[PDB]
Design an enzyme around this catalytic site. Structure first.
Site, PDB file in Angstrom:
ATOM      1  N   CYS A 149       2.702   8.249  -8.613  1.00 43.03           N
ATOM      2  CA  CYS A 149       2.945   8.497  -7.192  1.00 43.03           C
ATOM      3  C   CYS A 149       1.742   9.115  -6.500  1.00 43.03           C
ATOM      4  O   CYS A 149       1.264  10.180  -6.889  1.00 43.03           O
ATOM      5  CB  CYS A 149       4.128   9.432  -6.984  1.00 43.03           C
ATOM      6  SG  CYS A 149       4.230   9.922  -5.252  1.00 43.03           S
ATOM      7  N   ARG A 189       2.330  12.559  -3.666  1.00 42.66           N
ATOM      8  CA  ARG A 189       2.818  13.841  -4.171  1.00 42.66           C
ATOM      9  C   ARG A 189       2.430  15.109  -3.424  1.00 42.66           C
ATOM     10  O   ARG A 189       2.947  16.172  -3.727  1.00 42.66           O
ATOM     11  CB  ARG A 189       2.464  13.997  -5.651  1.00 42.66           C
ATOM     12  CG  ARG A 189       3.388  13.233  -6.575  1.00 42.66           C
ATOM     13  CD  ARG A 189       2.959  13.423  -8.004  1.00 42.66           C
ATOM     14  NE  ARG A 189       1.824  12.573  -8.324  1.00 42.66           N
ATOM     15  CZ  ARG A 189       1.086  12.706  -9.415  1.00 42.66           C
ATOM     16  NH1 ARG A 189       1.370  13.666 -10.281  1.00 42.66           N
ATOM     17  NH2 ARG A 189       0.083  11.873  -9.643  1.00 42.66           N
ATOM     18  N   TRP A 240       7.674   6.998   2.230  1.00 42.87           N
ATOM     19  CA  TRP A 240       7.372   6.056   3.308  1.00 42.87           C
ATOM     20  C   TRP A 240       6.278   5.134   2.785  1.00 42.87           C
ATOM     21  O   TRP A 240       5.729   5.386   1.719  1.00 42.87           O
ATOM     22  CB  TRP A 240       6.949   6.772   4.593  1.00 42.87           C
ATOM     23  CG  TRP A 240       5.841   7.747   4.444  1.00 42.87           C
ATOM     24  CD1 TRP A 240       4.528   7.470   4.202  1.00 42.87           C
ATOM     25  CD2 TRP A 240       5.937   9.169   4.579  1.00 42.87           C
ATOM     26  NE1 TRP A 240       3.796   8.633   4.185  1.00 42.87           N
ATOM     27  CE2 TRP A 240       4.636   9.691   4.412  1.00 42.87           C
ATOM     28  CE3 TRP A 240       6.998  10.054   4.822  1.00 42.87           C
ATOM     29  CZ2 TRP A 240       4.362  11.059   4.482  1.00 42.87           C
ATOM     30  CZ3 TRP A 240       6.728  11.422   4.890  1.00 42.87           C
ATOM     31  CH2 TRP A 240       5.414  11.909   4.720  1.00 42.87           C
ATOM     32  N   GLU A 289       0.560  -1.843   0.464  1.00 40.47           N
ATOM     33  CA  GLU A 289       1.677  -2.325  -0.345  1.00 40.47           C
ATOM     34  C   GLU A 289       2.177  -3.640   0.264  1.00 40.47           C
ATOM     35  O   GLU A 289       2.392  -4.636  -0.439  1.00 40.47           O
ATOM     36  CB  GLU A 289       2.828  -1.309  -0.376  1.00 40.47           C
ATOM     37  CG  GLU A 289       2.483   0.077  -0.896  1.00 40.47           C
ATOM     38  CD  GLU A 289       3.719   0.959  -1.050  1.00 40.47           C
ATOM     39  OE1 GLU A 289       4.624   0.583  -1.827  1.00 40.47           O
ATOM     40  OE2 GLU A 289       3.795   2.022  -0.399  1.00 40.47           O
TER      41      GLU A 289
END
Ligand code: HEM
Ligand code: HEM
Ligand code: 1A2
Ligand code: 1A2
Ligand code: H4B
Ligand code: H4B
Lengths: 415, 415
Positions: free
Chosen positions: B114, B117, B286, B291
């Site tokens: 992730c 973070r 979000w 992506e």
């Protein structure tokens, strides 16, 4: 106690203690590490214990003979025989030129971080195993450079110097690569040239080399033969081919006055094969555009030309969200690609390079069920997933023969 | 025997046998692997052996109390006390809401893959540990979606369902993520929508779901409560916020008729904490532009719009060396970024995201000497080295609490 972690951008170091609170067996993975000890082959005070050497030698000789179609069993046994004999009589041994050639290609073949391996069988091998003096190394290196450069039509080659004997008679090139621009700490506080070579530059200055305080001064060869101290040899300028950078559209690109050398050649790696080690065996392939366009020209710790190219393009240099960086870098990449092409100097774009490797890997799996691959190095510094290798899972393991890294000489060497 | 390796682009599989000829201890690294068993936490026929549960529970309770400044020793001992008691009396235990909240953030905190973070402490936690029916799961999920979406101003949240008891009473979302477009195998041989969801789409069809044969049909929730078979619930369209794609310059961009959902939410992961396991705990953050722009829109195995955008831009689509792909992808990325901004829907560019993480990591090392990080996932699918994390070495280890992957339910589940 803890693990050291470095940021090659800011140079900063960090100590990690958390991994101690890790769980079971996950596959602390040290993959994000540049120079891990597992990939390094260092110094030695004495010869290689025969108990170790002999077995490795046998394996290797078995690999070599097990190579060609239509075996040569007699020759094989005889070689196995001759080799053992030579080892118990000398405490080492000499490879036949063919074995050498076979070794260097297979080592290249087993380089997990090399993306141009589909070329593995195309390699000129210069045998300098009889070299003895620094000046002799120099001549050999000059010859390599001239052959590989081939007036722009780059050829892959490797020159193999004498193998490590006792461990205190190592031939070694102190340079990272054959051609490399020097970086100077200017008096006004600024840095000129390649900031990445600041120390090594100083080392050459310290060895009597005269600095030219330029942005693109080709550093000198710092060679050490047998075991003697290193001697400095400047590279004959007629031998260093360069490409001046220009963009096919923005005529102000050349106003930047950029250029780069055409020859990418590793100078400090070690070639392990059949128990033998060659601490000096420079080799070269040809460039992939992004190395220069992205790494050399856009790394913060390098020439760092990104903002300058941004402003000149009229972008919103003060708004990350505008993706101005993605725009600039692409134009820098086209310049590099364009400039090399215009000047008839071999080079490859990262897309054709990526496809090239995928074909290699598939050929490699069929022929010998596997191909050591380090994803972190094989995926280009830009347009990662737009590339095939990004979606390819891969295993990274160290076979043999193999090209290892070595501890920087100036650290473990007495004058 | 050998290792299976997959190419998520062509789907092809390869068997690796070479790693057997590996050398000593290099750090066969399985880092390039998507779903390695080391990162998966699977099924179970019986409760968790008390001998294991108790110790983990203690550790966790020690982490929680060792958390806040100005300790609460009494409360700590008492909790340690109360917990043991509850375990030998029930064969398990219940976390206090606070422990839950603490657990979910630390798990997020320990997600090596992730990049967002730095937000770890900002997390809304919905406690659905008392849920009992599928329909009840549905209502909860709808609530999550509505809260997180917040009309474009995205909020991170996680909804925790009942923990795994015996192992045959698992609450589980069969979906990969909450919102996700369906992919259909058209009769004319072509594929419409998201080719990545072809099977799961069929699974929903097989469960009585009516296909709409569109390019962007939001798939239905396939929920299973307690242990019962999964029930299909369609998502109320008023709850699915979308962004229609348009470029700030090329007016023909919208002619492509692209759009994407605004809510990125994981649906199938497991939350391990203090010996406890939660096989159903959807969570969301979000989006990061790339992506959608790079992965969703440019992957070969996805919407694959690269060539189409190339032609429309007037590029040399038939010459890889022209770097037309690097150009197209950048424009697609600006469209995504632009469209989300224009429609007031939270999103972040990969550059600001990268810097964000670097700040997190440094904060993380100071506060607790470490931060598990998976470089392969943290470096964006484009402009890799133009990013700070590319030059940052990092260690990837599995702590606890932790979010694990799980074996696809439809594989290990009897009706
Ligand atoms: C035919 C052209 C070749 C091309 C296009 C090529 C290209 C590359 C590139 C792009 C890298 C990454 C460099 C970086 O990121 O810093 C690399 C690494 C590597 N290549 Fe190749 N290569 C070629 C030939 C060779 C040859 C002939 C050998 C050896 C006989 C070789 C050995 C290696 C090794 C060991 C590495 C890793 C170097 C390191 O770890 O620093 N390559 N190559
Ligand atoms: C505040 C906004 C957040 C952002 C911007 C963010 C962004 C991201 C991104 C870009 C990825 C990579 C996805 C991919 O490549 O497929 C990711 C992975 C991940 N994130 Fe975050 N995240 C956020 C919040 C969260 C939260 C709230 C949790 C959990 C409580 C979380 C848990 C994870 C996990 C476990 C992964 C790995 C998922 C996987 O392995 O498939 N993230 N995140
Ligand atoms: C080694 C990797 N490498 C290759 C290699 F092993 C063998 C054959 C090659 F063709 C290449 C190549 N195509 N680039 C370098 C990496 C770039 N390098 C340099 O000159 C560097 C310039 N600046 C650097 C920095 N900091 C590092 C290297 C040339 C060799
Ligand atoms: C899981 C990773 N991930 C996140 C996450 F865990 C938590 C919070 C987040 F904000 C994100 C995020 N920002 N994207 C996804 C990955 C993209 N994903 C999807 O909807 C996918 C669409 N197509 C896919 C394919 N093939 C995979 C995922 C949304 C969650
Ligand atoms: C820290 C990180 O490993 C390092 O900066 C990277 C990663 N991958 C790379 N990939 C290649 N090909 N060359 C490199 O120099 C690097 N460096
Ligand atoms: C094979 C490879 O691991 C895979 O295709 C990649 C790598 N890194 C990634 N990085 C992120 N953030 N997300 C991904 O989906 C992937 N997939």
């Amino acid at each position: 106690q803890y693990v050291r972690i470095k940021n090659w951008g800011s140079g900063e170091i960090l100590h990690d203690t958390l991994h101690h609170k890790a769980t079971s067996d996950f596959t602390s993975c040290l993959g994000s590490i540049m120079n891990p000890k597992s990939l390094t082959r260092g110094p030695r005070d004495k010869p290689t214990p025969l108990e170790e050497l002999l077995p490795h030698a046998i394996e290797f000789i078995n690999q070599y003979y097990g190579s060609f179609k239509e075996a040569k069993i007699e020759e094989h046994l005889a070689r196995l025989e001759a080799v053992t004999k030579e080892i118990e009589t000398t405490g080492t041994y000499q490879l036949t030129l063919d074995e050498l050639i076979f070794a260097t290609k297979m080592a290249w073949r087993n380089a997990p971080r090399c993306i141009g391996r589909i070329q593995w069988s195309n390699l000129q091998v210069f045998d300098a195993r009889n070299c003895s003096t620094a000046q002799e190394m120099f001549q050999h290196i000059c010859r390599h450079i001239l052959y590989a450069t081939n007036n722009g039509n780059i050829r892959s080659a490797i020159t193999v110097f004498p193998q490590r004997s006792d461990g205190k008679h190592d031939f070694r090139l102190w340079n990272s690569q054959l051609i490399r621009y020097a970086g100077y700490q200017m008096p006004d506080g600024t840095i000129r040239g390649d900031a990445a070579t600041l120390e090594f530059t100083q080392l050459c200055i310290d060895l009597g080399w005269k600095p030219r305080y330029g942005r693109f001064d080709v550093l000198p060869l710092v060679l050490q033969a047998d075991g003697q101290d290193p001697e400095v040899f400047e590279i004959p300028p007629d031998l260093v081919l360069e490409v001046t950078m220009e963009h096919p559209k923005y005529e102000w690109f050349q106003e930047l006055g950029l250029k780069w050398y055409a020859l990418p050649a590793v100078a400090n790696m070690l070639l392990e094969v059949g128990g033998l080690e060659f601490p000096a065996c420079p080799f070269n392939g040809w460039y992939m555009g992004t190395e220069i366009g992205v790494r050399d020209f856009c790394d913060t710790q390098r020439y760092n030309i990104l903002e300058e190219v941004g402003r000149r393009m009229g972008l919103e240099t003060h708004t990350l969200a505008s993706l101005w960086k993605d725009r600039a870098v692409t134009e820098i990449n086209v310049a590099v690609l364009h400039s090399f092409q215009k000047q008839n100097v071999t080079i490859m774009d990262h897309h054709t390079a990526s496809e090239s490797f995928m074909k290699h890997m598939q050929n490699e799996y069929r022929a010998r069920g596997g191909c050591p691959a380090d994803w972190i190095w094989l995926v280009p510094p830009v347009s990662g997933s737009i590339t095939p290798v990004f979606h390819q899972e891969m295993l990274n393991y160290v076979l043999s023969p193999f090209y290892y890294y070595q501890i920087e000489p100036w650290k473990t060497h007495i004058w």
